């Protein structure tokens, strides 16, 4: 009856930038998703491919908690088939998504007067990010023909831009922490079940 340590994911004191989103494996465990779904802290609980009411009924081989911090106006980019600068460039979900997305406002945790520049996002990369891919590489984005030897300038923009997370920003610009539960079941025995 070892309950799943969702506290180390949802209640973590320091989340990760959306480009370098953390991924925690959950298995050898029992997880009650009804507590998360019936929690008032979460502003968004969008389940794709499954239904949250039946989450405790099903079992999967393992769960992946993909934790990051995005902008409010940007939370709608964590749905399957969405496009933009987070979905296409930072964290892509396949249209055949079997999981859930859990977004809660975290202004009082990840904002700072003057800007919480500790959170970043990837404006620049060659191709759209493959679903469930992350790229932590900070390589100068050559947008032009001329190789410029890795100096930040025209057609050599730094690929990562910072998030301006101030407590006075409008809700669409406030830091929302997002945890994506990706559910995987296969020939390996279903190990993470729900009460």
């Amino acid at each position, epitope marked *: 009856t070892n309950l799943c340590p969702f506290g180390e994911v949802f209640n973590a004191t320091r989340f990760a930038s959306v480009y370098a989103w953390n991924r925690k494996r959950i298995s050898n465990c029992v997880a009650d998703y009804s507590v998360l779904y019936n929690s008032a802290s979460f502003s968004t609980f969008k389940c794709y491919g499954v239904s949250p009411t039946k989450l405790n009924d099903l079992c999967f081989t393992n769960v992946y908690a993909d934790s990051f911090v995005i902008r409010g106006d940007e939370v709608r980019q964590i749905a399957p088939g969405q496009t933009g600068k987070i979905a296409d460039y930072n964290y892509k979900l396949p249209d055949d998504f079997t999981g859930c997305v859990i977004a809660w406002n975290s202004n009082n945790l990840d904002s700072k007067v003057g800007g919480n520049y500790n959170y970043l996002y990837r*404006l620049f990369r060659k191709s759209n990010l493959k679903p469930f891919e992350r790229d932590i590489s900070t390589e100068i984005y050559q947008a032009g023909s001329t190789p410029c030897n890795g100096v930040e300038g*025209f057609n050599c923009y730094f690929p990562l831009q910072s998030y301006g997370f101030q407590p006075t920003n409008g809700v669409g610009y406030q830091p929302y922490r997002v945890v994506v539960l990706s559910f995987e079941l296969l020939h390996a025995p279903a190990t993470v079940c729900g009460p």
Partner: antibody, heavy 126, light 109 residues
Framework: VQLLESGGGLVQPGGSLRLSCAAS????????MSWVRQAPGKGLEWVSW????????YYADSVKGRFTISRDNSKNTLYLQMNSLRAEDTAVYYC????????????????????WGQGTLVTVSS | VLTQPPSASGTPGQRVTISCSGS????????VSWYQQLPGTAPKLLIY???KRPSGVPDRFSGSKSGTSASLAISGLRSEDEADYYC???????????FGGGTKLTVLR
């Protein structure tokens, strides 16, 4: 999307002052910014261009050294310190948003000078 | 320098070609842009790529960069089409967003 310039007025020759461009309606950190000069009844003369403070700042050949561009993404403002001003610089300064990002879904002025502010007017005269 | 005609013109309803030309560093290897500055107003970007056009601009404002010469084609002139049309392109050598001379488009009334 709107860019509002402030700081245009009387300038003594060789003087110093500060154009402040408040940018609203877009994520200020994602787009490059630039200043463009326009002498009264003359063409557009590019002043300067910036994307990041720690990166490379680009300046016109005629203003290298006497101009300094900077950003403040916390305030969503673009600042231009002009010092040791010379006579030909009496003009109208436009604060122009130069997009550089490409979202691969709908291109939005990916390499042009997308939106121009109302522009202030600087008179370098005693 | 984007060498551009000083004042092109045409009758309303005509298709006027404003063709500017710089160098390989000026315009051949960089994306040209076309801006329309009406008298007393800030310029409006009509063309951002060598060919592409931003939304909110009439479809008649076509752009086409062949080699080193960029053409802004304005088809169906009207009383709102008279303005200074600048072409601007980044310089790989001089490191400056060099604008054109400024074509003064006027309608033949």
């Amino acid at each position: 999307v709107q860019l509002l310039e402030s700081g245009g007025g009387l300038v003594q020759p060789g003087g110093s002052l500060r154009l402040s461009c408040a940018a609203s309606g877009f994520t200020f950190s994602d787009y490059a910014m630039s200043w463009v000069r326009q002498a009264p009844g003359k063409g557009l003369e590019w002043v300067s261009w910036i994307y990041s403070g720690s990166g490379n700042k680009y300046y016109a050949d005629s203003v290298k050294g006497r101009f300094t561009i900077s950003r403040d993404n916390s305030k969503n403002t673009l600042y231009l310190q002009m010092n040791s001003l010379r006579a030909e610089d009496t003009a109208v300064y436009y604060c122009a948003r130069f997009p550089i990002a490409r979202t691969s879904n709908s291109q939005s002025s990916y390499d042009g000078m997308d939106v121009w502010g109302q522009g202030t007017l600087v008179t370098v005269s005693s | 320098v984007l060498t551009q005609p000083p004042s092109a013109s045409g009758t309303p309803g005509q298709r006027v070609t404003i063709s500017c030309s710089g160098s390989s560093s000026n315009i051949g290897s960089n994306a040209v842009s076309w801006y329309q500055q009406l008298p007393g107003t800030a310029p409006k970007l009509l063309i951002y790529a060598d060919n592409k056009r931003p939304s909110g601009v009439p479809d008649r404002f076509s752009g086409s960069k062949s080699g080193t010469s960029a053409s802004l084609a304005i088809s169906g002139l009207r009383s709102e089409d008279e303005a200074d049309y600048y072409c601007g392109a980044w310089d790989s050598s001089l490191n400056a967003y060099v604008f054109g001379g400024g074509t003064k488009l006027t309608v033949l009334r």
